[PDB]
Ligand binder design. Structure first.
Ligand SMILES: Nc1ncnc2c1ncn2[C@@H]1O[C@H](COP(=O)(O)OP(=O)(O)O)[C@@H](O)[C@H]1O
Ligand SMILES: Nc1ncnc2c1ncn2[C@@H]1O[C@H](COP(=O)(O)OP(=O)(O)O)[C@@H](O)[C@H]1O
Lengths: 241, 241
């Protein structure tokens, strides 16, 4: 069983810094996951990381690309210092949605990833923000992680988010919103920023169409994600299957 | 006036370590060039950098991709530590030859690069070894650096190398080999590893055909390159124009 874990920007960053508390917790979780599964990490937050090195505004798209260029290698260095605690290494992979249309590009990427996994190295994927901007504009890697799950032959995508699950209505607006534990179909009526719930549901529709699964849970408190993946009991979050 | 400096793996590597000395020398040189020019760096040695962290056999191709994934971000952090001496930052760009065929990918890349240069950030380009292997197999970024030069609107590509220039015959094999100081045409008759002189000549042919220039010079002794670029005077190397 191979899983893809996707962590959004908010999960690993505050507005002016990286969240070392949350990164530490995530990395300890990934180290444990790696004993039980083959694990691929899809990370965001290169822009946050770059912003710690260069204080320019994030609204302009081209500014975001520059910040990502500066931030990406530093973000990887942070993951590597934290992984060192568990005697693990992380390898950087940059991909775009268009790479996934290419048999050749996908095959080369899968070769590297498969071998990393074989050596117990953690593959860490992010968008190539030099050549593509889709995930910077809208989605924050939700789609990229879904494509990775299918094309690298993983069984499950786990999205760790500031959203703890999918509800019958917006849970931040409506205190009576009820959590949907299981979704087997994504309604078209359900479908610029991080992407919100819509990019999460679009990723799920892609995965459902390729007979794969998605689990949506909190990256702020890892209890639900931990119990699902390590205790095989669902006590929160939404499973799409 | 904009230039690409390409540094090969030999020039910044030793047998089982990075050449920190020659990197330091390179960065000091780049810091002075930035006073006079818009500068783009194309670097190799992600594989050497990775072998420093992971002891697997460098001769296998998929191993090289893995070593590059680990090494690339570490290599960038070493550039950054050296650039901090001049209060400079580097930003990572990963490209492939195939990216250069797409107008959209190249455009997104140039947008980021142009802005980095405006802001004073050094763009540091390498091949994306997840999705392409061409330069790993044969050429060591000669061709990628030629494409970068043309498509990001630089006037001159400087290749820094083992060899101090292009010669009328192989200077390793012949004591009377004469160095050709200026070259106006690439004879088709002149046309796996780092590539030898031929990938350098293919690069020059590409650039002459696009009304651009190339300077082949030593990366071990920077005097010829420094004098050529900072003192507009050729005392060595080969100029292609
Ligand atoms: N039906 C719904 N179920 C869950 N969350 C929803 C729903 N409708 C709206 N939201 C809201 O979407 C918001 C944006 O999510 P977002 O911040 O993009 O997640 P991430 O940062 O992990 O991408 C959340 O604050 C959430 O409250
Ligand atoms: N006509 C020539 N001019 C210069 N070098 C040549 C020529 N023919 C063969 N060579 C060989 O090719 C080498 C340059 O290629 P390479 O070792 O790949 O350089 P780099 O260190 O830049 O990767 C030279 O050191 C030389 O031994």
């Amino acid at each position: 069983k191979r899983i893809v874990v996707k962590v959004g920007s908010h999960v690993i960053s505050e507005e002016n810094t990286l969240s070392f508390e949350r990164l530490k917790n995530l990395v300890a979780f990934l180290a444990k996951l790696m004993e039980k599964y083959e694990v691929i990490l899809v990370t965001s937050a290169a822009i946050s990381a770059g912003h710690t090195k260069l204080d320019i505004d994030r609204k302009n798209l081209i500014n975001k690309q520059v910040l990502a260029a500066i931030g990406q290698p530093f973000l990887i260095s942070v993951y590597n210092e934290l992984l060192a605690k568990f005697n693990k290494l992380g390898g950087q992979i940059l991909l775009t949605g268009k790479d996934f249309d290419s048999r050749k590009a996908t095959k080369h990427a899968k070769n590297a990833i498969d071998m990393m996994i074989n050596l117990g190295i953690l593959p860490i994927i992010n968008e190539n923000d030099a050549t593509a901007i889709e995930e910077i504009v809208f989605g924050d890697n939700d789609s990229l992680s879904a494509y990775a799950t299918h094309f690298f032959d993983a069984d499950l995508l786990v999205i760790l988010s500031d959203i703890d699950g999918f509800y019958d209505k917006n849970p931040s607006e409506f205190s009576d919103a009820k959590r949907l534990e299981k979704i087997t179909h994504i309604k078209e009526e359900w479908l610029h920023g991080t992407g919100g719930i819509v990019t999460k549901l679009k990723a799920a529709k892609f995965l459902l169409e390729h007979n794969k699964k998605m689990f949506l849970a909190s990256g702020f408190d890892l209890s639900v994600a931990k119990t699902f993946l390590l205790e095989d009991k669902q006590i929160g979050g939404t499973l799409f299957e």
